Symmetry: C2
Subunit: 453 residues, 2 copies
Amino acid sequence: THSHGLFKKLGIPGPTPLPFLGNILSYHKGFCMFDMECHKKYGKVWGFYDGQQPVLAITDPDMIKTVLVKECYSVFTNRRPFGPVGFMKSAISIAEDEEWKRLRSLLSPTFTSGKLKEMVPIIAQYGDVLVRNLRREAETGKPVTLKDVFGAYSMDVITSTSFGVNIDSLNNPQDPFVENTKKFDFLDPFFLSITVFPFLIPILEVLNICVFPREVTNFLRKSVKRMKESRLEDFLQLMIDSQKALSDLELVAQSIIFIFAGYETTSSVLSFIMYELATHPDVQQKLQEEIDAVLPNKAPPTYDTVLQMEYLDMVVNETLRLFPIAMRLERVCKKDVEINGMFIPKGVVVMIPSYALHRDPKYWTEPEKFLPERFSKKNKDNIDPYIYTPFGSGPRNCIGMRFALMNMKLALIRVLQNFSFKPCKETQIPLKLSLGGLLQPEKPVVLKVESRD
Amino acid sequence: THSHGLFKKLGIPGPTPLPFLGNILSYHKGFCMFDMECHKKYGKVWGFYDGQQPVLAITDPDMIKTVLVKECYSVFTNRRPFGPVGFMKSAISIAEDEEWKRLRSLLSPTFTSGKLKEMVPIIAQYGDVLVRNLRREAETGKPVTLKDVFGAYSMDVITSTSFGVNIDSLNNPQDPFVENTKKFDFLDPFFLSITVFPFLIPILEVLNICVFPREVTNFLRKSVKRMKESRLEDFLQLMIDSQKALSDLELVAQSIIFIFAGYETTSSVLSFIMYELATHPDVQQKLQEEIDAVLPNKAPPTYDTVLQMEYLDMVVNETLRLFPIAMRLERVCKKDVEINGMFIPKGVVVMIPSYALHRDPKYWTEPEKFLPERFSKKNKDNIDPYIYTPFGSGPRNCIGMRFALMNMKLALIRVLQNFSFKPCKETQIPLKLSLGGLLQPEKPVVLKVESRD
Ligand code: HEM
Ligand code: HEM
Ligand SMILES: CC(C)(C)OC(=O)N[C@@H](CS[C@@H](Cc1ccccc1)C(=O)NCCc1cccnc1)Cc1c[nH]c2ccccc12
Ligand SMILES: CC(C)(C)OC(=O)N[C@@H](CS[C@@H](Cc1ccccc1)C(=O)NCCc1cccnc1)Cc1c[nH]c2ccccc12
C-alpha cells in the first residue's frame, strides 16, 4: 500500500484510503452518490484510490477542456485499462494510442451526414414495426415495459444498420441473430475483485478468460465470416470496402461495440425519456403538438425534419442531463505534466464526474427538476459545454453521437404521433437510480399506454 | 519440477515428463489412445505426470478391487479434485470423505427397485412422445441426427423424473426449463491450463468464477426455490421429505448432477447403440425379434419386461465396452499404503484406464469388433468384472446405474418396435472417436430411418 501517499504528497484533498481496498468501500451507493458527495465537500478537485489506483477528479471547465481536447493527443489518450478482454483488445473504445488513432480514423466516416441521411428510409421501416408491436398491447390495457419494446426496436435498428439482417425481434424472441444479442456492472463480485487484484488480470488472459464470455464472440466470428464474403459475394459493408490495414478478427471486435453501444444505450435512454414525459404530461402535450406541426397527417419523418423539431431536441438533452448513462469520463495520464497550474504524475487516471456536474447547484437551477426549457435557444448559452457532456468531448468523444441522437428521435416521433403514456401503480415515482454500477432504473420502467383513435 | 522424480525413485516405468508440462503433450490424441499405448508398452502398471501431479495407472484385477472396494473407505475415497466449482463443492461426485458419505447415504434410496419401478408409467408416457416426434421425420426421408432426438427424450425423462415438469423439448425448443438445460472437455484451452496451473484454482474461487458459469446455476436456485415450497405447498420430492442435515444450496447442487448425468450420458450412449445396430443389421434384426416376442402387439413395456429381454441387455453391455463414456476411473490416495506388494505414497492419483482395458487383447477376442454375443449367459463368465467397469465398482460406483440402464432400454424398446435404421452417406464408418477429452463421436451420428407399416 505504498502508493496511497500520493495525494497528501501533492497536497490534494480526498477520503482516507484503507489498505489494499483504497476507497472502494465508499461505492456502497453507486459512483454517482459518491461523486456528488465528494464534489460537495472537497470542491473543484480531489483524489481517491480505486485499490492502489489513484484517481484525480477535476471540475474546472478549462482543465476538462485541456484533458479532453487540447492535450488529448499527447497526454490523456487512453481510458483506464480494464480486463480481461481477449481479442477485444482491438476494439476502439478499448484500444490505445497509435492503434486507436488508426481505428478512430478508419471508422470515423461511418457516421457522416451523408451516411446518416442514407439510413432514414431503412430504419423508418422499423419505426412502423415499432408501432404495430406497440398497438397490440395498447388494447391489452395493462402496464407496458419500455426496455423490452424499445430493446426490440433498437435491436432491429442495429441488426439492419450493421448487417442487413431484418428481424422483428419482439415477435422473434428466437432467431440466431437475436438470441445471442440478448446475452458491465463495475461493482459486482467480479469487477470489484479486479480493482483490488489488478495484478490478476494477466492471469485470466493467459486462461483465454474474457469478460465478453467466448459463447457470444464465437457466434459472430463466423456469423460475420460467411456474411463477410460468401453471403454477399451498413457499417459492415463500409468496413470491408476497405478490408493502415484491418484484420478480420479486428473487424468482429468493432461490430460488437456498435451492437452493445446502441442497444442498451439507445433503449435505456429512450426509457428514461418516456418516464419523464409520462410524469410531466405538460411536456408530453407540448411535444405532441410540435411533432404534429412539423409532420402533418402523422407524416413520415426525414433527416431534415428531425433536425428541425427543437422542443424534441430540448427534451432529449434534458433527459441526458438527469441521466448521463456513462456517469464518468476517464483518461489515463501518459507522462509527468502540469495543467492549469496543478501537477499530474505519470499513471494517474484523470476522471470527470458527469453525473454530479449535471446536478451541480453552482450551474443548474432546480437540479433534480425536469425542466426541458433550460435548452431553448433563449437559455442554451447559459450552459457550459464542459459541464454538460453526455457524449464526452474532444477527439475521443462518442463516435456514434449523431446516430444515437438521430435514432432515438425517430423512435420518439413515430411513437408520439400515435400513443400517449401515463403513470401506473407499479410506476416508481420518483425513479430511484440503480444502487449498482451503471445508470439504469433500479426497478424497470413500466407505464400506462393509451392510443389516439 | 521437484516432484517428477517420484517414479524413478519408486522404480515404476513411464514416459519421461517435461518440466512443468509433465506428460500433458502426450494427450494430443485423447486420453484413450495415450492409455492404449502406455498399456501396450509398459504393461501391468506405469506412471505419468499431469503437470506436477503424479498419476499411477494400475491394471491388476486384485489391485483394482482393493482400490475400488476393499480400501475405498479408508484410502481411496475421493476423485482427483478439479475446480473452480463454487457452491458445487457439495455435489456428490465432487464431495469428499465424511460429507460425501453423508450425501451418498442420504441420496442412495432414490435409486431403489421400488422407486425405479414407480417410474415406469411416467417415462413410458414419454416413450410415446419420442415415437411421434420420430415418426414425423420418418416420412421426411432424409438423415436423422440421434443426439438431438435422444436429447429431447432423455431431457423429457429427466425434467419429469426430477421436478415433474412435463415438456416436449424437441417441439419446445423454447420454454425456460429446456433453454438452460441445453447450456467438460478436459483438454480445451482452459482445463489444460488448470492442470499446468493447479495453483491458480484458489484464485478463480476467490473471484466466484465457476466452470459451471453462474447463469445456469442461478436459474435453478430459484426455479427450485419456488417449487421447493410455494409451488407444491421425483428426486426432488424424495429430498425435501428429508429436508445429517441437507441445506437448500446443497439441494440445488445434486439436482444439477442428476440433470447432466443422464441427459448427455443417456443420449450419448443411446446414439452409440443405434450406430452399432445400423452398421450391424443382423443384430438389429435379432433384437427386433426378441422385443416383439416379449412384447406382442408392440405392447407397452414394464419393469419386469425389461429385465427379461437379454439380447437387449447383451447389446447395451457390448456398446458400453466399446464406448465407456467415463474413459477412466480415478481415486486419490489418502495415505502412505502398500497394496498388492507395491507402495503408494500420499497424494498420488490412482487411475484405471477403462477404455483401454475394454479393448485389451489379453482379455477380448476381436477387440475392435462389435460382438454382443460376448455377454450371453454362455460366455458372460469368461468376463472379469474388474476389467469391464462402465459404471465403476465399489462404494463410489455410479449411483444411477440401474436407472440409466432402465431408461436407455425403455427408449430402445419403444423405438425398435416401430422403426429401423440404415447407414447414410454422411454416416461415418467406422466411427472415429473424438480427438478431444471426452468420449463422443467426432462427427455426430446421423442415420437413415424407415418405418414398419
Ligand atoms: C444515448 C446514446 C449514447 C450516449 C449517451 C453515448 C455516450 C458516450 C460517452 C459519454 C462516451 C465517452 C466519451 C468520452 O470519453 O469523452 C462514448 C464513447 C463511445 N461511444 Fe457513445 N454514446 C451513445 C451511443 C453510442 C452509439 C449508438 C455508438 C455506436 C453505434 C457509440 C459508440 C461509441 C464509441 C465507439 C465510443 C468510444 C470512442 C473512442 O474511444 O474513440 N455510442 N459514448
Ligand atoms: C449410460 C449412463 C451412465 C454411465 C455409463 C455412467 C457411468 C459412471 C461411472 C463410470 C462413474 C464412476 C464410477 C467410479 O468412480 O467407479 C459414475 C459416477 C456417478 N454417476 Fe453415473 N453413469 C451413467 C448414468 C448416470 C445417471 C443417469 C446418473 C444420475 C441420475 C448418474 C449419477 C452418477 C453419480 C452421482 C456418480 C458419482 C458417484 C459418487 O461419486 O458417489 N450416472 N457414472
Ligand atoms: C452504459 C455504460 C457505457 C456506462 O456501461 C456499459 O455497459 N459499458 C461499459 C463496458 S466496455 C464495452 C461495452 C460493453 C458492455 C457489455 C457487453 C459488451 C460491451 C465497449 O467496448 N464499449 C462501450 C460501448 C458504448 C456504450 C455506451 C456509449 N457509447 C459506447 C463502459 C464503457 C465502455 N466504453 C465507454 C466509453 C465511455 C464511458 C464508459 C464506457
Ligand atoms: C461424460 C463424462 C462423465 C466422462 O464427462 C462429463 O462430461 N463429466 C465430467 C465433469 S464433473 C460433473 C459433470 C458435469 C459436466 C458438465 C456440466 C455439468 C456437470 C459432475 O458433478 N458429475 C458427473 C455426472 C455424471 C456423468 C456421467 C456419468 N455419471 C455421472 C467428468 C466426471 C464427473 N463425474 C465423474 C465420475 C466418474 C468419471 C468421470 C466423471
